[PDB]
Design an enzyme around this catalytic site. Structure first.
Site, PDB file in Angstrom:
ATOM      1  CB  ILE A  21      46.420  41.807  42.092  1.00 48.56           C
ATOM      2  CG1 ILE A  21      45.976  43.012  40.997  1.00 48.56           C
ATOM      3  CG2 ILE A  21      45.785  42.161  43.666  1.00 48.56           C
ATOM      4  CD1 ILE A  21      44.745  43.260  40.800  1.00 48.56           C
ATOM      5  N   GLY A  22      48.194  39.678  43.109  1.00 46.16           N
ATOM      6  CA  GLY A  22      48.626  38.509  44.240  1.00 46.16           C
ATOM      7  C   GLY A  22      48.184  37.380  43.574  1.00 46.16           C
ATOM      8  N   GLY A  23      46.304  30.255  41.453  1.00 47.37           N
ATOM      9  CA  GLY A  23      46.964  30.886  40.189  1.00 47.37           C
ATOM     10  C   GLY A  23      47.044  32.464  40.403  1.00 47.37           C
ATOM     11  CG  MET A  24      49.357  36.293  38.471  1.00 49.73           C
ATOM     12  SD  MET A  24      50.664  36.387  37.072  1.00 49.73           S
ATOM     13  CE  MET A  24      51.799  35.918  38.193  1.00 49.73           C
ATOM     14  CB  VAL A  25      44.733  38.183  41.145  1.00 54.46           C
ATOM     15  CG1 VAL A  25      43.808  39.002  40.879  1.00 54.46           C
ATOM     16  CG2 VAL A  25      44.164  36.929  41.872  1.00 54.46           C
ATOM     17  CE  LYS A  40      39.313  33.136  41.124  1.00 51.64           C
ATOM     18  NZ  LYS A  40      38.860  33.138  42.680  1.00 51.64           N
ATOM     19  CG  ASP A 130      38.405  30.392  54.242  1.00 56.32           C
ATOM     20  OD1 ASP A 130      38.747  30.522  55.338  1.00 56.32           O
ATOM     21  OD2 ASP A 130      39.167  30.231  53.292  1.00 56.32           O
TER      22      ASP A 130
HETATM   23  C1  N6U Z   1      38.387  36.846  46.578  1.00 55.07           C
HETATM   24  C2  N6U Z   1      39.915  36.880  46.787  1.00 55.07           C
HETATM   25  S1  N6U Z   1      40.957  36.824  45.414  1.00 55.07           S
HETATM   26  O1  N6U Z   1      42.256  36.534  46.118  1.00 55.07           O
HETATM   27  O2  N6U Z   1      40.490  35.281  45.181  1.00 55.07           O
HETATM   28  N1  N6U Z   1      40.421  37.641  44.361  1.00 55.07           N
HETATM   29  C3  N6U Z   1      40.837  39.041  44.264  1.00 55.07           C
HETATM   30  C4  N6U Z   1      41.979  39.422  44.940  1.00 55.07           C
HETATM   31  C5  N6U Z   1      42.447  40.883  44.707  1.00 55.07           C
HETATM   32  N2  N6U Z   1      41.805  41.802  43.816  1.00 55.07           N
HETATM   33  C6  N6U Z   1      40.447  41.292  43.589  1.00 55.07           C
HETATM   34  N3  N6U Z   1      39.473  41.822  42.747  1.00 55.07           N
HETATM   35  C7  N6U Z   1      38.436  41.211  42.523  1.00 55.07           C
HETATM   36  C8  N6U Z   1      38.897  39.796  42.879  1.00 55.07           C
HETATM   37  C9  N6U Z   1      40.074  39.989  43.627  1.00 55.07           C
END
Ligand code: N6U
Length: 337
Positions: A21-22, A23-25, A40, A130
């Site tokens: 999705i986008g 340490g790693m998620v 994550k 933030d």
């Molecule tokens: C809260 C932003 S994050 O990048 O830390 N977590 C996150 C990213 C993308 N999708 C998510 N779904 C639940 C938590 C995330």
């Protein structure tokens, strides 16, 4: 253990079929609840990890991301990575604004949910510190949840004051003017400014104050609000900050309806009150929810608050790396078999 893009992502047999999705998620299939979840990986350790876990486990609110599970090794000695499992959310406001025009109805609904979550956070005497589009998650039906409490603090208005040009950690484009002048960002008004910035960004799909460096952020703010009033200047007692402001040429206010010719007039009235230069005159979260723009949604009986103010037991700032790992281990204990 499964790998994703050259990273081990080892989330037991409960969670399978991992996609980045986008340490790693990653997304993953939860074989117990039978839904895809977000996970994550956090990989010595950081104050921010602990701060977030304690807050999110304590908080329970529809507009605040929860923690559903935490995966770690059974002992401190074996614990290296921590995995935090949360509801999968299709997108976030940053991604959404890069690709989509929002209707006024969507802008209104998103703003309502941001402030409803923020009411709860502030009622716990916590500051997010933030808020920005990428920390606002959304699902396919446009439910919104506030995430990332890694810079959150207990409010401390009596120790808010600092000198001019004091370094700050939170994302630059969403920093209130007072951060650059005389503020440590220890009051609730810091979060309202961020929400103001987000509202502006929903109106035009572009950040309102895209400063490229620390003091340029303040130049962008004053370029639209115009020069502070004598009364607002007199509130800044710090002479370096005061005299910097007095040194600038007069700047006229840019009318909101000229920056935002398509916006609803009630949205711009609320924007004005959120983007007030003087943090003492800035609207508070409960006043914002009661504003005419949000009349279709406003219902204080359905805008819950926290049962108690949140408290960090010891000052996390002086903690050696060993005590911090032990604290993370202890805070994650409830998710162990
Ligand atoms: C809260 C932003 S994050 O990048 O830390 N977590 C996150 C990213 C993308 N999708 C998510 N779904 C639940 C938590 C995330």
């Amino acid at each position: 253990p499964e790998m994703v893009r050259g990273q081990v992502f080892d989330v037991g047999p409960r969670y399978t079929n991992l996609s980045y999705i986008g340490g790693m998620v990653c997304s993953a299939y939860d074989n117990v609840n039978k839904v895809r979840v977000a996970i994550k990986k956090i990989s010595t350790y950081c104050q921010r990890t602990l701060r977030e876990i304690k807050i999110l486990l304590r908080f329970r609110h529809e507009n605040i991301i929860g923690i559903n599970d935490i995966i770690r090794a059974p002992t401190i000695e074996q614990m290296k990575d921590v995995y935090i499992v949360q509801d999968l959310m299709e997108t976030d406001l940053y991604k959404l604004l890069k690709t989509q025009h929002l209707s006024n109805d969507h802008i209104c609904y998103f703003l309502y949910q941001i402030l409803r979550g923020l009411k709860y956070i502030h009622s716990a005497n916590v500051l997010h510190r933030d808020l920005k589009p990428s920390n606002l998650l959304l699902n396919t039906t446009c439910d919104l949840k506030i995430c990332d409490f890694g810079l959150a603090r207990v409010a401390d208005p009596d120790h808010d004051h600092t000198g001019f040009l004091t370094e700050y950690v939170a994302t630059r484009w969403y920093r209130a003017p007072e951060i650059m002048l005389n503020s440590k960002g220890y009051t609730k008004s810091i979060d309202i400014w961020s929400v103001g910035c987000i509202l502006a960004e929903m109106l035009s799909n572009r950040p309102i104050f895209p400063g490229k460096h620390y003091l340029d952020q303040l130049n962008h703010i004053l370029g639209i609000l115009g020069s502070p009033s004598q009364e607002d200047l007199n509130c800044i007692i710090n002479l370096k900050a005061r005299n910097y402001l007095l040194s600038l040429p007069h700047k006229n206010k840019v009318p909101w309806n000229r920056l935002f010719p398509n916006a609803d007039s009630k949205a711009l009235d609320l924007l004005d009150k959120m983007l007030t230069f003087n943090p003492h005159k800035r609207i508070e979260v409960e006043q914002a929810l009661a504003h005419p723009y949000l009349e279709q949604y406003y219902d204080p009986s359905d805008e819950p608050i926290a049962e108690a103010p949140f408290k960090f037991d010891m000052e996390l700032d002086d903690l050696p790396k060993e005590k911090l790992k032990e604290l993370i281990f202890e805070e994650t204990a409830r998710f162990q078999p």
